[PDB]
Every structure is written in C-alpha cells, then in structure tokens.
Design a protein around this ligand. Structure first.
Ligand SMILES: [N-]=[N+]=NC[C@H]1O[C@@H](n2c(Br)nc3c(N)ncnc32)[C@H](O)[C@@H]1O
Ligand SMILES: [N-]=[N+]=NC[C@H]1O[C@@H](n2c(Br)nc3c(N)ncnc32)[C@H](O)[C@@H]1O
Ligand SMILES: [N-]=[N+]=NC[C@H]1O[C@@H](n2c(Br)nc3c(N)ncnc32)[C@H](O)[C@@H]1O
Ligand SMILES: [N-]=[N+]=NC[C@H]1O[C@@H](n2c(Br)nc3c(N)ncnc32)[C@H](O)[C@@H]1O
Ligand SMILES: [N-]=[N+]=NC[C@H]1O[C@@H](n2c(Br)nc3c(N)ncnc32)[C@H](O)[C@@H]1O
Ligand SMILES: [N-]=[N+]=NC[C@H]1O[C@@H](n2c(Br)nc3c(N)ncnc32)[C@H](O)[C@@H]1O
Ligand SMILES: [N-]=[N+]=NC[C@H]1O[C@@H](n2c(Br)nc3c(N)ncnc32)[C@H](O)[C@@H]1O
Ligand SMILES: [N-]=[N+]=NC[C@H]1O[C@@H](n2c(Br)nc3c(N)ncnc32)[C@H](O)[C@@H]1O
Lengths: 257, 257, 257, 257
C-alpha cells in the first residue's frame, strides 16, 4: 500500500517516524504523501487533526493511525513501543469509522468538515443569533458562542462546555452553549442538544453579521455571513484497528486515571 | 379496533373521557381494557406513564395517544379540543416508536422497562457503587445517586441533572450523576454519558447492598442487591401519529415559551 | 487546661490518642470530657463533626483541633507525626473562628447548629417548597431538595451541588439547589445564593408537610413541619492555631493535588 | 447640589432627561457634568456602567441614580414615571454603597476599577495561566478565560458562568472559570471561588503573554503582560436611596418573573 507519516516535529516524533519508514522499507510499501492509503500521525490529537485535514479530500480512500509520543490521545492511541508491531501488521486489518460534522457558511457558500467540532463566536461584540432546527425557530441565543460537536469530539471542547460524552458508533451531533444569558428577557434551552442524521441546525445573525467561526484547529473571522448550517456529514473517517481499545476505556484512561 | 381510555381522575379528564367513549360508540370500536389495540391517556405525562406501565406486556400490540387536559406534555401532546377529530381518525394512521430502557436487578433477578428513566439512590446512608461498562471497570462513584435515561425521558429528570436532550429516533441511553464527590481521593467522569444499543452498564455495590431503585413513577427499596444492569431495551413503545408535532418543537413549547 | 480526645475508633487513632494522653500527663493538663477547654479529634472531618456536635453547648469555651489519621481534612488538618509537637504547644496559642449556620424548625420549635450544612429533602414524594427571603417570596422550588452551607462547609456537599467555595472569614451562608425542575411552569433562580448575616431564608411547605431534614451528619424525618428558617448563627466555632495553614492551600491540597 | 444626567441616546431617554432638567430648574440645583454631586443615568445597566466609568475619579463625592427606560436593571432600578418624584426628593436621602473590584496589570503598571467584573481571555490562541492566591500557587488553568466579579456584578456575566449571586453588602470577589479543560493532565478547582477583602489573586502567563483583558464594557488587548492582580477595591460606589428595593427582590423581578 501507499502510505505517509506526519510528525509533531519534536525530536522523539521525527526519530520514531524515520524508524517506521525504515521498517516500512523492509516491506512492499511505497511512501507517497499525495495519494496514500494509510496515514500515520505521530504526536498528539492535535497532530492527528492536522493529518486529517490534510487529507480530507480522500477520506474514504484512507485509513488513519494515531501514535502518541506524549500523553495518550483519543485519536493518537497507540504507544510508541508498538510502532514496530504496527508496521508488520500494516504490511497486509479491520477498519473503524467515525461520524463527521458538516458546516456550511453562506454569504457564495463554503463547506467544511470537522473531526471534533465547529464553533461560532462574536467579533469583538455581543453575540446574538437565532437557532433554527429543521426550519423551525427554536430559540434566540445570547452569549459567548455555540459549539457543535461530533461524537468523537465530545471528549474535547464539548466536554468543557458541559456536553455529554457520546459513543462514536452513534451517528449524531451535539450542540452546547457558551455562557448563555438567561433572564426574563432572554431564554435558551440550557441543556446540550443531540441531533440525529439529517437534522439541520441553522444559525442566523440577528443584528451583527460578523462571526469568528472555527472548525477544529482552524479559526477564521467570516464577514457578511447570512447563515451557518450544521448537520451530520455523509462522509466518515476510517481508522485502522489492530486490537481492542474500547472508547469507554479510552475515556477512563484519559479522565479517571 | 379494541381500545381503552385512562384518566387523571379530575373532573375535566373524566368528562373528556366519557365524551370520547360516546363518540367512539358511533363507530366500529369496542372498548376493552384487557386487550386494547389503542390506549388513550387523558391528563399529563404522569397519567401517560401509568398508562404505559399498565400495558407494558403488550407494547408491540398497542398504539398510545396522549391528551393533555393541563399543560402540554411530551407524551400527552394532543389538545382536548382535538379529541373529536382524534376519534374519527382512530376509526381507521402512522406509528412512531421510541426506544426503551431495560433495567435488571440481581440478588433471583427482576427485569423492568422504563419510559423515562431508572435511578439508583442509597438507603439512608452513603451511596458508593462501581460503574462497569461492558465488563470494564470505568469508575467508582460516590454521591447521591445515578440516573439512566431513555431518549424521550431526557427532557425530564435527566434534564435537571444536567443531561443533554436527545432526539427519540436515536436508540440510546444517558447516564448522569447526582452530586458526585470529586477530590484527590474520589474521581468520576462528571460529564453525562450516552450509550448505544448493546452497551451494558452495570452498577455494583461496594460496601452497602441496599439501594432505593426507581423506574419512572414506581420507587422501591431493594435489599441484598448484587448488581443493577442498564441497557437499551429491544422493545419499543408505539405512538399513533395524526399530524406533525416535531420533538424539537415540543421542546421549544415546553421550555422556551 | 482541661482537655479531651475523640477517636475514629480504628487502631491507628486510639493508639495515637493514648500516646497524646500519655504525653499530656507529663504536663499540667487534666483530662475531662465534661468541661474541656480543648477538644482534640483524631480521624477525619467526619470524626471532627461528631466532636463538634458533642460539645455544641460550650462552643465559646472550647478550642478545637483536628488530627487526620487518614487523608487530609478541612477540619482534621494536622498530621499524626505532629501530635507530639502539638502537645507541648497546647501546654500553654492563637484562635481562629468560623461562622456557623442556625436552622430553625417549627411545627413547637427546634433549633440546630450546623458546621457544614443543613439540607431539606422530600419524604418519598415530590418536593415542593416556597422560598422566602426576608419575608419576600422569592421562588417556588420543585426538585430533590435544597442545601444551605456554612463558609467552611462549602468544600463539602455544597461543592458537589455546584456551589462556590467561600473563605471562612466571610460571615455568610450559601443556598444551592438539588435537581430543580425548570420549564415554562416552574422557575427557580438556578444560581447558588450567598446571604450575609441577619438575612433569613425560610422554606415553607406547599402541599406536603413532611421533610427529611439534615444537619451535618444527623438526618431526621420531621412531620407536620410548618417552616424551616436558615440564618447565619451568632455563635462561632473556635480552632486552636499553631502555624499557618491557609484555607486556599487546604483547598489546593485537597482538590488539585 | 451640582448634578448631571446621561442618556441611552434613544428618544424616550433624552426626553425624560430634558424633563428632569426642566423640573430640576425649579429647585436650587446647578447642572454641572464636571463636578456633579449627583449622577443620574437614564437607559439601562449598560448606560449606568458608562456613567460610572465617566466619573470613577470622584466616586466618594458622587451619589448615583439609575432610571430604566427599558427593562428593569440592577443599577437602573427606578421607573420613568417616578422621575418627577425623584426630582423633588433629590432637592434635599440615604446612601447605599457597593464594593468594587481593583484590577492591576503589570508589564509599567495600569490600575482599573470594575463595577461588574474583569475578565481575561487569550489572543487568538490557547489560554494558559497560573493562578496564585496570596502568593501561593493554587492551580494552572487551561481554558477560554477567567472572570472576577464584584458582588453586584454577580447577576451579570458571573451568573452565566455558573457563579453564585452574592449580596452587595458582602465585601468580596468571585472568580469563575470559562470552559476549563480537566483531564489527568490539567486540573482546576472547577467551583467558583469567593475571596474576602485583602485577598490578592494573581494571574501569571505560562507561555504566551498577550491577553484580551476586559473591565466591564471596555475590552483591550494587552501585550507583554507579566501579571494581572485582582483584589477587592478600597473604593466603593455610592447610590442614593429613596425607598426600599431589596437586592433579593431585584433578583426575583429580573429572573423569576
Ligand atoms: N487547545 N486545546 N485543548 C484541546 C486538548 O484536547 C485534546 N483533544 C483533542 Br485535540 N481532541 C480530543 C478529543 N477528541 N477528545 C479528548 N481530547 C481531545 C488534546 O490533548 C488537546 O491538548
Ligand atoms: N490541540 N488542538 N486542537 C484544538 C482542540 O482543542 C479543543 N478545545 C478548544 Br479550541 N478549546 C478548548 C477548551 N476550552 N477546553 C477544552 N478543549 C478545548 C477543541 O477540541 C479543538 O478542536
Ligand atoms: N415528579 N416530577 N416531575 C416530573 C415533571 O416532568 C414532566 N415530565 C414527565 Br412525567 N415526563 C417528561 C418528559 N419525558 N419530558 C419532559 N417532562 C416530563 C411532568 O410534567 C412532571 O410534572
Ligand atoms: N409525575 N411524574 N412522574 C415522575 C417523573 O418525574 C421526573 N422527576 C423526578 Br422522579 N424528579 C425530578 C426532578 N427532580 N426534576 C425533574 N424531574 C424529575 C422523572 O421523569 C419521573 O419519571
Ligand atoms: N458522606 N460524605 N462525604 C463527605 C466527605 O466530605 C469530606 N468533608 C467533610 Br465531613 N467536611 C468537609 C468540608 N468541610 N470540606 C471538604 N470536605 C469535607 C469528608 O472527607 C467526607 O468523606
Ligand atoms: N462523613 N461525613 N459527614 C457527612 C458530610 O458529607 C457531605 N456530603 C453529603 Br451528606 N453528601 C454529599 C455528596 N453527595 N457529595 C459530597 N459531600 C456530601 C456533607 O458535608 C455531610 O456533612
Ligand atoms: N453584553 N451583555 N449582557 C449583559 C446584560 O446584563 C445586564 N446587566 C448588566 Br450591564 N449588569 C448587570 C448586573 N449587574 N446584573 C444583572 N444584569 C446585568 C444588562 O441588561 C445587559 O443587557
Ligand atoms: N451591556 N453591557 N455591559 C457589558 C456587560 O455584559 C455582561 N456580559 C458579558 Br461582557 N458577556 C456576558 C454573557 N455571555 N452573559 C451574560 N452577561 C454577559 C457583563 O456584565 C458586562 O459587564
């Protein structure tokens, strides 16, 4: 198979990267960072996100692998000392797929894919937007911002915002609030909201039309925005599985001890 | 079809009940509260829960309908003045089904079905239980109790405990904490947790083996409990639909205005 | 001075207790568990609470000391190996005082003192009470219960309920909610509330008049309750200080590492 | 007395402003917006904040009054139709004072006064700062930002962040977190923290030294920041009281109905 390896850039990661390339050169494996079939990220969840976004155009043709040089990640969940064992097995394994989040920004119109989440915040001013679920006006939100999370991205930002952690087999999306004002005047649901496939959540500007929008790592101020559409993507990310590392055990190791 | 009608018991509900029976007697509809095919609840979500639990043994043979005499419910979501229109249409409609929660209590062994949630609390003492997800020890919980919620039951108790609201089409279950102690000694996940079908969450007593266990309305102290097993049921509840009343619009009307 | 020592009852605590008594017998110190001037608790915060409540009638005549045999406490914050050093110094030290919470239950009328908190919960049914602050009706609460916490008791139950941690020098009280229902029908403030001295918070039964009331460790069901009054006590608990152990450092050690 | 009146700028506010000036010209009252003894704000809490910050250099020489043209405020708590009655009484009343928050930013060094709160956020990057309470390292915070609130400012931003509402007679300050990351690696207290007078909370940059700092309305990016110091101010704001409008009744009207 064709393959490639990205690295956090620190000493430990590049050296582990060169060792895997060296071991890969002992097999029928061509290194190609243009049309790989296997993408190996070495570093952290952050390095893995970048790896994903570098190859989001060939998602269904790639199987991803995450090696953590530092602390255990949710995407980078293979230990360095398992790299050699990883190489042999890749020389031939099952695939596990996770849901993705599609974000649409209209003015033209730009579409994005998120692996963790997309968020919306205000550009140096009060953030007020109308939330419309499947064309039905649901609430007028006033606060810092909102966050729409993929299932696997719920252990990240979503978690800090009070969202629930959801198993990646569930094809869904989760909206959480960031510091919502709630008085007699303004009213929001408060609770996080989990949407199934085909549900479309649309954020519409009330007065200001300039938002700071984020999709995973990349955060860009968008001007003259007319709408932000959130819905579970039809595309999925594919991981290569070599053993059992249950999502709930990954949660336990990361958060409980 | 065979049918029956339960009532909150107040004046408005019994009179609306007799009027529907009267209108039903104008059609080919036999009243049978033993083997009905249609069960109509008149009152609130509470009256509907009772109606459900009265016929939990014939769930797949029944289609439920909820009329709210008081404030709009999540199960009792038909207005009184729509009763006459409801009668005609029932004389012949589509069905919508919601996931249920199976709870197993072992000592023998007793199984239950919940429409909203099942909770576990301590019997006049400190509540400590081990949480095991799919046979993997996940955490040791110390607090007031835990709550496992169906999708449709998330707008209820689950909501107050900080859980997220999830759409009933998603076949899942949600575990939330009740006042968990978190220090250097004790550690719980904090976030609510959403499990898919086939996931089994098991609560195991640490020292005390007496818990106050609840399934919807009914709450009973169980002694010598060895285990409590939570998993999405294979059975579902079937509603009769006569028009569009989206779950998210039902949420909006109940919580936003 | 006259003194006494209580013990958790385990092996380590009684032996540390006898060693201190032995060392105390080397000085001018009479052991008297009737009218002590110094009360030394050996065990945990729990053992200290009991020690407090055993001598709540002579609070202003006693100086308390807490030795933790187990993990560091907020009241039991002296290490065992500091006991010998503690004995010498007690043979002669500054005093630090903490606010207390007075609870009044009317039917006659019973008054209590709390070192951590007092809580109110329902007796096997729905909990609904009116909250009246200084004779002004503030809200109708519907949920599991409420909790009124002393400043030093905020790191305990109050903390789990989402309350804020407040420095014991501040003479105040904190009310937090337990799973409050909030919809279009019912409305509570949600936020915890901090009251100054002389503010009186009164809980009044709406329908049911039977509550499970708790003051620290002791929890008793009260019947025919007409009112529960909360206000910062005029009495304070006095600790004996031998060195600097700042409240915020005590918080750090307990919760951060 | 010398006096002045600020206005939200809309039609209703300027006309109410001119009417009060007209009525004031019937008494011994000189209009002076340089050295007033009475400052009357007409609009909302926002218009009142501006009024405060315009005269923060003569706080102890001024008595403030807030008239709400729109919805009831916490500072603008006089109804328009009470303006005429207000004028007569001002022609001669008791004063109520609220604590303030002093913020110090070091690089030189700049000091500020806040009526609601001061917050710290990151400049287009990860926010990480060390929290030091009275020179003792308390925690390393990683998240969106932190918020330090005055007592009267707790019903504002502090409230949305989960803080508790505290009575303005209590001389204190409240720190709340904004989306703190909490895993095995990073650990924060989570709970809001209430500090008494003379406690100094200091935020120190870990890697990045550029923060977006806010004091009430004004928000400015500060570069090369070395420290941010929070402590209850020695200065207080003085209101003119003409009748009883209890803080807890002001809370009820704003949030409960
Ligand atoms: N910036 N920031 N904080 C994000 C932190 O979340 C971690 N993280 C990332 Br990226 N994705 C995550 C995920 N899906 N679940 C949990 N943690 C994640 C990662 O360790 C990073 O340090
Ligand atoms: N490293 N990295 N990647 C950035 C990731 O940090 C996560 N994140 C961000 Br941004 N802010 C966060 C916060 N305040 N707390 C936790 N995670 C956060 C989120 O998952 C984002 O995708
Ligand atoms: N006891 N209690 N409180 C439960 C309150 O929740 C409401 N309720 C019930 Br029952 N089921 C519910 C549901 N699934 N979603 C929202 N509210 C519900 C009902 O109005 C009742 O008064
Ligand atoms: N009426 N009724 N039925 C009882 C329902 O009240 C709900 N409930 C209970 Br019990 N306690 C609750 C609380 N503290 N807050 C909201 N809902 C609650 C839960 O959904 C239960 O099934
Ligand atoms: N039951 N229970 N849980 C209470 C736990 O809180 C601890 N605790 C007590 Br008692 N008082 C406390 C206090 N004021 N602050 C923090 N923890 C406390 C104690 O360790 C006990 O195990
Ligand atoms: N051990 N002991 N003493 C009992 C103390 O446990 C504390 N506590 C109780 Br009761 N329930 C608690 C909970 N769910 N979480 C934390 N602390 C609790 C509270 O401070 C009480 O005074
Ligand atoms: N931007 N923003 N939101 C702040 C909202 O808080 C309100 N507000 C202000 Br300003 N100060 C407040 C305070 N101390 N308490 C409650 N609300 C306040 C005001 O109505 C404003 O619309
Ligand atoms: N209008 N006005 N003044 C700005 C006030 O809005 C308040 N505020 C801000 Br900024 N963000 C807020 C939020 N997300 N929610 C509530 N209040 C907020 C805060 O009290 C600030 O002083």
């Amino acid at each position: 198979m064709k393959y490639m390896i990205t690295s956090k850039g620190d000493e430990k990661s590049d050296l582990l990267r060169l060792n895997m390339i060296a071991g890969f050169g002992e097999y029928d494996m061509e290194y190609d960072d243009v049309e790989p079939e296997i993408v190996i990220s070495i570093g952290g969840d952050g390095t893995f996100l970048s790896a994903f976004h570098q190859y989001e155009e060939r998602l269904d043709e790639i199987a991803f692998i995450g090696i953590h040089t530092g602390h255990l990640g949710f995407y980078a969940d293979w230990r360095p000392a398992e790299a050699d064992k990883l190489v042999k097995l890749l020389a031939k394994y099952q695939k596990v797929s996770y849901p993705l989040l599609k974000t649409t920004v209209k003015y033209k119109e730009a579409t994005y894919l998120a692996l963790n989440e997309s968020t919306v915040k205000s550009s140096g001013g009060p953030f007020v937007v109308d939330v419309v679920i499947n064309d039905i006006h649901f609430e007028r939100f006033r606060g810092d911002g909102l966050c729409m999370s993929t299932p696997s991205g719920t252990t990240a930002y979503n978690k800090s915002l009070g969202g629930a952690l959801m198993h990646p087999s569930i094809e869904a999306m989760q909206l959480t609030e960031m510091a919502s004002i709630n008085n007699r005047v303004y009213r929001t649901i408060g609770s996080p909201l989990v949407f199934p496939k085909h549900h479309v959540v649309s954020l519409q500007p009330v007065n200001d039309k300039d938002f700071q929008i984020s999709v995973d790592h990349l955060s860009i101020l968008h001007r003259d925005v007319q709408e932000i559409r959130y819905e579970v993507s039809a595309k999925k990310i594919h991981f290569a599985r070599f053993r059992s590392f249950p999502f709930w055990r990954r949660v336990h190791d990361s958060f409980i001890e």
